[PDB]
């Protein structure tokens, strides 16, 4: 009736302490934000479950 | 009106959710990290001369 409440740091995953990478990530908009909401939503359900 | 998104934790949330009014609850607004201090550089003891 549950699974692990995982979480991912988008910036850490994509850009391993790279400024140039970060600039080249920001150019893609809300990519990280969207992923964060999705993962949060799952964890919320895990609690209800 | 206006919000200075760097003033305080409240400001971050308001800007994050794109609203001047928040209903209630706990929200993740960003990641965080600790900033490194000095430098540590190490080179081999004895070389050929």
Curated annotation (Swiss-Prot), chain B:
SS bond partners: 5-15
Shown residues within the full chain: 274 to 322 of 1255
Species: Severe acute respiratory syndrome coronavirus (SARS-CoV)
Record: glycosylation sites: 45
Function field: Attaches the virion to the cell membrane by interacting with host receptor, initiating the infection. Binding to human ACE2 and CLEC4M/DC-SIGNR receptors and internalization of the virus into the endosomes of the host cell induces conformational changes in the S glycoprotein. Proteolysis by cathepsin CTSL may unmask the fusion peptide of S2 and activate membrane fusion within endosomes.
Protein's UniProt name: Spike protein S1
Gene that this polypeptide is encoded by: S
